[model samples]
Target chain A: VKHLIVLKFKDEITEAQKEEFFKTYVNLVNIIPAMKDVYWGKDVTQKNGYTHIVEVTFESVETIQDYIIHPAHVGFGDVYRSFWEKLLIFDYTPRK
Target chain B: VKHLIVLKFKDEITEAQKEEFFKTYVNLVNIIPAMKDVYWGKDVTQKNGYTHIVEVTFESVETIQDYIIHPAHVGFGDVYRSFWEKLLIFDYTPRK
Candidate 1:
């Protein structure tokens, strides 16, 4: 299963703040067992305001709910929401 | 490296059109040398109007230019655009 997050940081947000959020968000892989791995980067196309992308792979679709309410994820969201103007999330089990 | 394409289908587009487009787009993996694999799915979150996501894993960043102008890809886009209300694209090399 894959979890996709595309972020549009507020213009007022500082680079340091964005860095801090990503740094902290990536580390959650170590703390949350369901999170298998995370891959993220700045959008190279730059065609839209959405400037960053994060894709998280999970062990299974069933484990996503557990990861969502996990204290570590909730804790991260509480602090990180302030830095971005928009946060778009999508979860799916990839199909051919 | 990954290329991300998020799509919002036009309300008037028929299901047959969507199925045809995706069926054809996925097959590009066989024709484009730089294209490695394509993973796609509907947005389970449904938090926004962007209802679908396609993530294409590529062999390298340099090869993306070739894939863009590839005859197969160009041919696919020529027909697919009519079905979507909006198209958003982003490309990135994953980072730790």
Candidate 2:
């Protein structure tokens, strides 16, 4: 399964805060076995208002169930939302 | 590099129209040398408002420059946007 997240931070947020949030965000891979690989970047083009994007890969759709409730995943909830006003999460299996 | 596109179509659009759009969208892979793999899905969880997501993978950031101007891409511009009310496009390089 491929999990995608798009984030739009509050206007008041600073670059340093954004960097810190991602540092914490990506670390979940070591804490949660379900997360295989993580990829993230700030949008290179300003054509869209959304700023940052993350792609978290998993072995299967079932693995995500463990991820959502895993303490390490649940634990980051507050810190994760602290920086964003808008967020979009999408999960899907790629078609062969 | 990975290219992500999230689409929210007009309420008036039919399922048939959405399916047709994606057929054309994914076929770009066969026509454009820069497009490596295309994966698309309808949101599995309704947690977010966006209905559809697409990820297109390419060899490098530089390859996307060729994709944008390729006639096969530019030719689809009008039909591509016709079905959408809102759209988000993000390009990112995965960090190791």
Candidate 3:
């Protein structure tokens, strides 16, 4: 199963701040073992200025569950708390 | 400058046909002169079965408008009409 989490930062944060936040987030991705793949890119038009799209994959639902409660994830939350204004998470499993 | 088109196909279509359709669509992207960039991917989880996100960019709004009404675009539409069940287009301009 793969969980797709879409996060949008608050408008008040400057571009420099958002860049800094994503730099940290990218570092965290490198350290996470359960994560199968990670892809991040910015919106080309700069429209909405929401310059980050992240895709993370896991092997199974159980693994994803572990990832959510994992200590590293908790550390991510602490840093993310100061950066984003709104965050949306969508979870979906492959259809049989 | 960037347009995001999210497409959902009819449930009746089989997975094989969808793959074929996307393959042709990707070919069309390569031939389009006005298109500055294109990025596409399928929904990982496939919750809605609405798999396909296409991001296309143009140099200017006029260029994008031209691409929409261009003859090649019409030809593409002819092909698309037979494949897709539903399509959604969202347009956004960069914030200053």
Screening candidate 2 with a backbone cut-off below 3 angstroms (N, C-alpha, C), the clashing residue pairs are none
Per-model TM-score versus the true fold? 0.91, 0.85, 0.56
Model 1 lDDT tens row, B1-96: 889999899999887877777888889999999899997888777766888898899877788889999988988878777888888899899997
Q: For residues A1-96, write the lDDT of model 3, one tens digit per residue.
A: 445444567778888887776667656656777767654555544444344555566787667767778788888887678677655444444331
Which tens-of-lDDT digit does each residue in A1-96 have in candidate 1?
Answer: 889999899999888988888899999999999899997899887776889999899977789988999999999988877788987888887887
**When only chain A is evaluated, what TM-score does every model earn?**
0.92, 0.91, 0.74
How do all the candidates rank in terms of TM-score, highest first?
1, 2, 3
Candidate 1 off by > 4 Å? none
Candidate 3 lDDT tens digits, B26-79: 666667778777656666544444566666767776677777887777888886
Name the runs in model 3 displaced over 4 angstroms. A1-5, A35-39, A46-51, A55-69, A81-96, B1-5, B11-16, B33-41, B44-50, B54-71, B81-96
Question: What's the lDDT for residue A24 in model 2?
Answer: 84
Provide the lDDT at B84 for model 3: 74
Superposed Cα deviation of residue A15, candidate 2 (Å): 3.4
Quantify all predictions' global Cα lDDT against the true fold.
Answer: 0.87, 0.84, 0.63
Chain B of candidate 2 versus the native chain B: what TM-score? 0.91
Number of the candidate with higher TM-score, 1 or 2: 1
Error of 1 at B84 (Å): 1.1
